[PDB]
Amino acid sequence: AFSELLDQVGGLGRFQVLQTVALVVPIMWLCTQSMLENFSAAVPSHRCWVPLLDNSTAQASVPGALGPEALLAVSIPPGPNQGPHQCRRFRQPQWQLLDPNATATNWSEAATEPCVDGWVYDRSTFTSTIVAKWDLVCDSQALKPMAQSIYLAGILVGAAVCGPASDRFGRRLVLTWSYLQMAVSGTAAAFAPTFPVYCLFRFLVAFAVAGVMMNTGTLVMEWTSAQARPLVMTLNSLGFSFGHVLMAAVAYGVRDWALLQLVVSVPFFLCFVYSCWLAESARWLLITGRLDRGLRELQRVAAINGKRAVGDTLTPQVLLSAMQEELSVGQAPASLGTLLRTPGLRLRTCISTLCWFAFGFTFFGLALDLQALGSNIFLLQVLIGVVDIPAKIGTLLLLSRLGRRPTQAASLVLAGLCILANTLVPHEMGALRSALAVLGLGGLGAAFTCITIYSGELFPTVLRMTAVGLGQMAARGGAILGPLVRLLGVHGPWLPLLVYGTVPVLSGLAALLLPET
Incomplete structure (x- = not known):
């Protein structure tokens, strides 16, 4: 809501902690769903x-x-x-x-x-797999990356339909519906008797994942006070980073392609069930003409937070008066017609989109085929999860005590260079190869968290949202295009890794031109 009303209710209190605890937990399962492919689609010797x-x-x-x-x-x-x-x-x-x-x-x-x-096939390590069930080998080999691309495609469509819809019906409604859809599609995909059915259910799961991802972040942003927004966003990212450790811990227990999917996707039923007592943001309610319900929710939160008299004294007249600033200026999203037309600002948008796409392409193209990077998948997953955390924490300190542009360029260049070097070294030393891969993935994560902050600061306040959306769309497009590169692996496994290493290096070198801050 407006700053005055939120301050009167209380910027930080019980409700903020409860909502953050409730919302962070499903993000780990979302990361588990995204990374389930490494284990539910392994390729054994055939x-x-x-x-x-x-x-x-x-x-x-x-x-x-x-x-x-x-x-x-x-x-x-x-x-x-x-x-x-x-x-x-x-x-x-x-x-x-x-x-x-x-x-x-x-x-x-x-x-x-x-x-x-x-x-x-071989049942020594995996008891069953999708590849061994639908003979996705030899002439059907190309069908493996394809299934990976469609899933990502779903995410891209999700943000295209969860954007306006959530702006008309609400945030909590969309979040709850997406939880339900995730649970149902995940439960159903385990029993798919044919490949296209499984692909369809995976695409629907991706749609729901995109909806959830957008809505939790929007809700968290709206309710928290102004001074503590980035601090909560970094926790929201740290949950997704711990999702990797959760994925590594789960796969080691169950060795199957149906049981794993079912166990991963069953908790979203509870997520839906308890997601009915979360409060709908009063900001969206008040701007969209919904006054009584917003006032009721504000009073409910005030009672929850431990301040009853303050909430009781509230009346619709003060509510209307305090929010006049937003109502008078009905900020309408500006199209790209006023963004790309200015010659001076073209370069900034070009490089920002280039960086977004570079990360969204390389990180997913590399993470999805985790087998080729090292020897054993479980250790690589655990180390990725463990190492992502320190890099994300240290990037903030670097930004505080160092420029944004040097940090972005260095992180991207170093991640790309480690990825490239991973290929050159022989296969005798598995430990060094795994370490190089882990460092590269950590560097990509650091680069993503840095560019997320850097993109908004470049452009004016009015045009920030359009540029951010363009960057997100470019990154998702790159993610979709990532897996398709593996079709060149018939020449040799080294070419995809060479491409994945060359793209980030060039993107980072290019990102040294745009101005600081």
């Missing part, structure tokens, strides 16, 4: 089905016993990188390759056959 081994009758027919390692060569051509070919099989058994003396070069997939009878 040999080609062979009747000689799986069908016990044929194997037992041969007198004596033949070791599986020796009997595998006779029916699997030697694939690249000294391994078994992933999507082929010998047309007929070849006992000549059985003798180790003969060179295996003559034995190749030239006279082989495709995987007619299906693939055999």
